[PDB]
Amino acid sequence: SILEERIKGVSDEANLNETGRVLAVGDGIARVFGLNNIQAEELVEFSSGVKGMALNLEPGQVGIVLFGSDRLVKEGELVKRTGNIVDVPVGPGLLGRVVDALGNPIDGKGPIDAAGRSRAQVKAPGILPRRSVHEPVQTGLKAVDALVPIGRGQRELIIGDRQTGKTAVALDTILNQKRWNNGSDESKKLYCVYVAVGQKRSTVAQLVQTLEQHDAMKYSIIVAATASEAAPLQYLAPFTAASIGEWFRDNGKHALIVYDDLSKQAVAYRQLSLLLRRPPGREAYPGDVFYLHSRLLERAAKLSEKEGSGSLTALPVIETQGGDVSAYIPTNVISITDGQIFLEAELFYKGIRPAINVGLSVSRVGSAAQVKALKQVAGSLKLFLAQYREVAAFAQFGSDLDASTKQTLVRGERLTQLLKQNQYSPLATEEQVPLIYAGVNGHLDGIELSRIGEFESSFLSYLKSNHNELLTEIREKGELSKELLASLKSATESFVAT
Amino acid sequence: PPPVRLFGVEGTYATALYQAAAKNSSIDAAFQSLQKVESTVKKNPKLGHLLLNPALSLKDRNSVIDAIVETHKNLDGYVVNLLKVLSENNRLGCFEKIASDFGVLNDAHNGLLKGTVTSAEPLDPKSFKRIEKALSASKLVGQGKSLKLENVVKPEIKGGLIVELGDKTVDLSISTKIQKLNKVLED
Amino acid sequence: STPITGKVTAVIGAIVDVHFEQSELPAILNALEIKTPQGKLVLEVAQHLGENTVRTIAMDGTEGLVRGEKVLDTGGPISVPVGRETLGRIINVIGEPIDERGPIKSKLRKPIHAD
Amino acid sequence: TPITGKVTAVIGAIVDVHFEQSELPAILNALEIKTPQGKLVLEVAQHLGENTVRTIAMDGTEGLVRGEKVLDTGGPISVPVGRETLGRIINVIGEPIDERGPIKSKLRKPIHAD
Numbered sequence: 001s002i003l004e005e006r007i008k009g010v011s012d013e014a015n016l017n018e019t020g021r022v023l024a025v026g027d028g029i030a031r032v033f034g035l036n037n038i039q040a041e042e043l044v045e046f047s048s049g050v051k052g053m054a055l056n057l058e059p060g061q062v063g064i065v066l067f068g069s070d071r072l073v074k075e076g077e078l079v080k081r082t083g084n085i086v087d088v089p090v091g092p093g094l095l096g097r098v099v100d101a102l103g104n105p106i107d108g109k110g111p112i113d114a115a116g117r118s119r120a121q122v123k124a125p126g127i128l129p130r131r132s133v134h135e136p137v138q139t140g141l142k143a144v145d146a147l148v149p150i151g152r153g154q155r156e157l158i159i160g161d162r163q164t165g166k167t168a169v170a171l172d173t174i175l176n177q178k179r180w181n182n183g184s185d186e187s188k189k190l191y192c193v194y195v196a197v198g199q200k201r202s203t204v205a206q207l208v209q210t211l212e213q214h215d216a217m218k219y220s221i222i223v224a225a226t227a228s229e230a231a232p233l234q235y236l237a238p239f240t241a242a243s244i245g246e247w248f249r250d251n252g253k254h255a256l257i258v259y260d261d262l263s264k265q266a267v268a269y270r271q272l273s274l275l276l277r278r279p280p281g282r283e284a285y286p287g288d289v290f291y292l293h294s295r296l297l298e299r300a301a302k303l304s305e306k307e308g309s310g311s312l313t314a315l316p317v318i319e320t321q322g323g324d325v326s327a328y329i330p331t332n333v334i335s336i337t338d339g340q341i342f343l344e345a346e347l348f349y350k351g352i353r354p355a356i357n358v359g360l361s362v363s364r365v366g367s368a369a370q371v372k373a374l375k376q377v378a379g380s381l382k383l384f385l386a387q388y389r390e391v392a393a394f395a396q397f398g399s400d401l402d403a404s405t406k407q408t409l410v411r412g413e414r415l416t417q418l419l420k421q422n423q424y425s426p427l428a429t430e431e432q433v434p435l436i437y438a439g440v441n442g443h444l445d446g447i448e449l450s451r452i453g454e455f456e457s458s459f460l461s462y463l464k465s466n467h468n469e470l471l472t473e474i475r476e477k478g479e480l481s482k483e484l485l486a487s488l489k490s491a492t493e494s495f496v497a498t
Numbered sequence: 499p500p501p502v503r504l505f506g507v508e509g510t511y512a513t514a515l516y517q518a519a520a521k522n523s524s525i526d527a528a529f530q531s532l533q534k535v536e537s538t539v540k541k542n543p544k545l546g547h548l549l550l551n552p553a554l555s556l557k558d559r560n561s562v563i564d565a566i567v568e569t570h571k572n573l574d575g576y577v578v579n580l581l582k583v584l585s586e587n588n589r590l591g592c593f594e595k596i597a598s599d600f601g602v603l604n605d606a607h608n609g610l611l612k613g614t615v616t617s618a619e620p621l622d623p624k625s626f627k628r629i630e631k632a633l634s635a636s637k638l639v640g641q642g643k644s645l646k647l648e649n650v651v652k653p654e655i656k657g658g659l660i661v662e663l664g665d666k667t668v669d670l671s672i673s674t675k676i677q678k679l680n681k682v683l684e685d
Numbered sequence: 686s687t688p689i690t691g692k693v694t695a696v697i698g699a700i701v702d703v704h705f706e707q708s709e710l711p712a713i714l715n716a717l718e719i720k721t722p723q724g725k726l727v728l729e730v731a732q733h734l735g736e737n738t739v740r741t742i743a744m745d746g747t748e749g750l751v752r753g754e755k756v757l758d759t760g761g762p763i764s765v766p767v768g769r770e771t772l773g774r775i776i777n778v779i780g781e782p783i784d785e786r787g788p789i790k791s792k793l794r795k796p797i798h799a800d
Numbered sequence: 801t802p803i804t805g806k807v808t809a810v811i812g813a814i815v816d817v818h819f820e821q822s823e824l825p826a827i828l829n830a831l832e833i834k835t836p837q838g839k840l841v842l843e844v845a846q847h848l849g850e851n852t853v854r855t856i857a858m859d860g861t862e863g864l865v866r867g868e869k870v871l872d873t874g875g876p877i878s879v880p881v882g883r884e885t886l887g888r889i890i891n892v893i894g895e896p897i898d899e900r901g902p903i904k905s906k907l908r909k910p911i912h913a914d
Contacts, residue, residue: 003568007545010554010561023553026827026846026854033552040696040750057696057752060552071828071912075847085749121748127775127783278697288698555822555850588850652708 018081020062022046025075028066028231029275032079035062041120043082048072052079053086053232056276063276065232067102088240089114090247094221095191098208101225101233101240107208118243120236124299125249131304135254135311136369137190140176140426141169143419146378146436147358148339151369152190152254152311153302157333160343162319165354167207168423169343170194170258170317172354174216176426177256181219187309191248191255193221195241197234198264201226210424234268235292242299242312249303249310257300260317262293266329282328290332297336325360339363352420359389371429372479377436381415384440388412411445417452418444430475431460434488437480443492451498458498467491501606508592509599511583515576516603525576529604532573536597549590559585610644613663618653618671625649629661638663691717691756694738696747701728703756705737714798716759717741727763727779728756744778762796801825803872807833808852810864815842817870818852828912830873831855837863841877841893842870858892876912880905 012021020034030052035044038057044064045051050072056063064079088103093113100106103114135152138145150156150173158169180188196204204224211217221244225237238259248255266285273279273286281287302311316337318330323345325334334340344357367375391408395401401409418439435456438444447455463471470491473484480488500517504510519525539546545565554561562585566578573580584593615621615629630647633639645663657672689711691703705711711730718725728741744763765780768791775783782789805819817831824847825831832839842855879894884904889897896903 001568003565004545006564007548007561010557011548011551021553024847024849026848036753038752040752041748055697057693057750059694059702062752063697069827071826074826075824075849076822128785276697291699553849 018083019078022073022075022077022079023061025070025073027275028070029272030064030066030070030073030079031061032064033061035079035081038062038081039083039085041085043084043086044079045082046073046079047077048074051082053236055272056278065272065276067230067232086120086236086240087117088120088243089116090118090244091115092191094193094244096218096220098204098222098224101223101229101237103240106224107222116247118240118247120239120243121295122243122246122299124295125301125303125307129303129306130301131309131311133302133311133365134368135187135302136371137180137256137313138176138371138374138429138432139173140179140428140432141172141354141356141421142427142432142436143356143358143421144173144341145370145429145432146374146381148341148361148363149365149367149370149374150313150363151302151365152256152313153300154339154363154365154369155297155300155314155316155337156339156341156363157337158260158315158317158341158343159320159325159330159334160341161323161345162321164343164345164348165423166317166319166343167203167260169341169354169356170260170315171207171210172421172423172426173256173258173315174211174220175214175424176428177219178214178216178426179428181216186253189219189254190313191219191221191253192216193223193241193245193255193257195223195225195238195257195259197225197237197259197261198227198268199224199260201228231268231271235265235272238262238265238296242296245312246299249301249312250308252303252308252310254311254313256313256315258315258317259296261319262316262333263318263321263329265292285329289329290336293333294336297333338365352416353423354421358385373433373474373477374429374436376480377433377440379440381436381440384408384411384415388415411442413449414444414447414452415439417449418456420453430471431463433474433480434459434463434470434492437485437488438492441489441492447497455498459492459495462495463491466494500603502603504599504602506599508587508589509596512580512596512600513603515580516600516607519576520607522576525574526604526607528573528576529600529607531571532577532597532600533604534572535569535577536594536601538569538572539594539597546590549593551590552588554588558588608644609642610646611639611663613645613647613661614650615647615659615661616650616652616655617659618651618655618657620651621649621659633663638666686755687757689758689760691737691739691758692753693750693756694752696750696752699743699747700740701743701747701750702734702738702740703728705739705756705758707737710737711739711758711760715761716763718757718759719754720757724781727759729763762798764794764796766791767793767795801872801874805851805853805870805872806867807864807870808866810861810866813857813861814854815840815857815861815864816848816852816854817842818850819870819872820851822851824851824853825872825874829875830877831870832873833857833864833868833870835863835868839893841873843877876910878908878910880908882906 016034017037020032022030023033024031038054040057041053043051043053050066050068052064052066054062054064089112091112091114097105097109097112098107103112105112133151133153137150137152139150160166174192177190177192180190208217208222211220223241225234241257245255245257266289269289270285279287281289297314297316300312300314303309318333320330339362340360342357342360344355347355347357387408391405392412395409470488500513504513506513516529519528562581566581626647626649630645633645634641639645655671658670660667660669660671688709689705691705693701694704695702710733713730715730717728717730727744729744730739730741732740734740763779766789770791771789774786774789776789777783780789803819803821805817807815808818809816825844827844829844831842840857840859842857844853844855846854848854880903882905888900888903891897
């Protein structure tokens with residue numbers, strides 16, 4: 001009576017469906033007393049304004065990961081369920097815009113022209129929705145194109161030690177997509193989405209300036225989640241980037257998505273799991289780290305005529321801090337991905353800058369995503385190199401080896417020097433075909449190692465002037481005729497040396 | 499030592515308080531009056547549903563004292579100290595738990611026992627009495643200790659019977675016998 | 686429904702804990718179905734933890750789960766279809782066609798766990 | 801603020817206070833424990849609730865008697881800045897070490913910043 005009245009008086013008097021009162025704060029991860037009805041992965045607006053998604057629905061007390069600071073939070077406040085799982089504006093308005101994780105333009109070109117909203121997770125296109133890939137795309141790096149041909153829909157993991165131009169490898173791909181960008185067709189046009197996770201604002205800002213300089217910022221979308229920005233938001237950042245990608249793909253338009261670096265995504269999810277007290281896996285990266293990565297990566301596709309015709313191309317990037325690929329996170333990713341694009345540090349110093357060590361680089365998808373002409377010319381490029389690797393290994397001793405082995409040794413040396421790539425220079429495939437022809441048909445085997453660099457510049461110039469008929473044809477027909485090969489043979493010979 | 503060791507997780511501290519109720523031996527009658535306090539908690543459950551609600555601090559302890567003011571005093575000063583202790587440990591979800599456990603200790607001191615004869619189906623009242631009798635005419639109820647034999651219905655526990663009391667059972671069900679028959683005729 | 690009605694208690698990931706009704710417990714390696722607009726989410730019972738609260742591992746994906754959500758029990762290991770009518774078609778974990786040549790209609794089904 | 805509390809536990813240099821107010825000074829606020837050690841500067845990092853916060857202690861916790869009063873600074877430590885801090889060596893508490901007298905400062909700013 002009096003005790004029941006007084007009981008009602010000291011009682012909250014709310015069923016805490018749609019709401020709950022915070023209890024126990026700290027660690028940037030909250031715990032609420034209440035929230036009896038709650039949907040999973042829903043967004044809950046804490047009444048200190050901060051919003052936090054909910055990842056633990058542990059009995060009676062919901063473990064809500066903040067998207068902001070807890071210094072804003074003060075214990076005992078109400079949190080009221082937004083009732084919406086996280087969603088992002090997606091549109092073509094992202095073209096020439098930097099956006100933060102929640103899609104708020106941090107480039108400050110004001111509100112995105114968002115032709116849709118999407119959901120944090122959107123399931124990958126099935127077996128049947130994909131078209132069987134046959135879409136070539138060329139990065140403008142001859143070694144990449146020739147040795148590990150890139151297609152659209154495939155995942156190729158760029159791996160190698162941190163900031164050894166780790167960023168720069170990716171940006172090179174973007175620059176050669178100018179050739180396609182200029183091109184009218186939407187199937188040609190890659191609307192390229194560069195995701196930068198954990199990276200400092202200054203780095204990104206330099207990058208956008210470089211993109212603006214190279215005038216590609218136009219067809220570029222920059223999705224960013226800088227280091228300061230919240231760990232849930234970092235985890236959520238690839239998946240909402242992915243959603244933007246699926247929209248392009250759905251539209252029939254092609255795109256390419258760079259996920260640099262997934263390694264910091266893992267650390268973010270690690271932080272969450274260890275402060276949600278969820279069981280931490282090997283290297284303290286949680287047990288369902290694989291689940292996140294696999295779903296993200298398998299969203300990449302090329303679609304058939306069932307839906308669209310677009311294809312999102314993916315380039316995941318893992319920067320191996322230890323350089324250890326047998327570590328849990330690289331290992332998991334390596335299994336997921338269709339390729340590895342291993343880089344070697346020693347070879348960076350050796351003067352290939354960027355340096356790609358193609359011993360551990362694979363593309364299982366292969367040369368169906370390689371231009372027919374380019375398949376022909378780089379056909380025995382691989383054989384020569386493979387022989388060179390073995391031959392070179394014995395050869396360092398300094399002994400005068402048998403001549404047959406030194407035919408390999410001499411040819412092989414020239415090839416490596418020929419391959420060498422310089423930062424910020426993408427190469428036109430039409431003018432990558434001659435160089436690989438020349439080398440493979442051994443016209444440069446004789447040409448001294450020292451002057452290979454000199455010869456290359458001049459050779460292109462000489463062809464540009466004289467055998468410009470050849471260049472047009474390589475572009476136009478994309479497969480080299482016997483006649484064209486012969487013409488090319490004569491041409492290479494014609495420029496006997498510089 | 500209290501009659502029967504509960505193992506005493508949380509509520510076992512209150513079982514030791516029941517040992518103290520034997521020590522200041524009016525606490526044995528205090529276990530009857532504390533059962534009356536549990537009856538007050540049984541009138542409580544609209545407020546008891548609020549009482550499972552967390553976060554009542556010193557104000558929660560004062561609110562519990564207000565419920566105690568609605569009470570007449572069953573379980574006395576030991577019960578009041580338990581109200582403070584449970585308040586201090588802040589848990590209503592092991593409030594009734596202590597009640598049930600104190601009940602077990604209390605009725606152990608009384609010497610009442612609880613048996614059960616789970617069967618596939620209900621059993622005769624003639625059967626009920628005859629087994630209670632039998633148990634008294636066995637060492638199981640040595641007599642000096644009461645019994646509350648409860649037949650339970652569980653058709654999942656197949657035909658026949660299983661008698662349970664203490665750590666002692668006779669299981670003359672069908673399933674176990676069928677199992678044995680099968681095994682040997684697969685051998 | 687089923688008398689083996691459980692209400693989710695904790696979604697902390699794939700682990701989803703369910704609070705089945707007292708005395709009406711399932712068994713290890715059972716398959717729970719939860720009716721959902723995604724079909725029926727299947728949770729494989731992997732532990733009993735006490736007082737008809739199980740801890741089960743999800744098979745299929747999760748999201749939007751309402752904590753306290755009624756859980757029906759299939760009662761045992763996932764039952765696939767078996768037959769020579771399983772020949773020449775794509776089947777998935779719960780046995781659903783991916784080639785979508787309609788349901789894999791078969792005379793018999795079998796459990797996933799077998800000795 | 802004049803929110804006092806007492807020190808319930810002293811587990812390492814991670815003291816736990818039990819504030820009397822159910823308003824618990826927000827995360828990254830600063831607290832002064834009033835002692836013959838002057839103040840001890842603590843910074844609330846968790847609220848463990850029950851009106852018992854758990855606080856990082858920046859200054860040494862030696863000699864602490866359990867149940868020792870706290871006072872709430874009420875926010876992140878306010879440093880002393882100025883152009884007259886040029887030529888001063890400051891401790892963590894923001895006080896001389898080179899004893900160029902009391903820090904000439906106009907504006908005092910929260911340690912944490914966005």
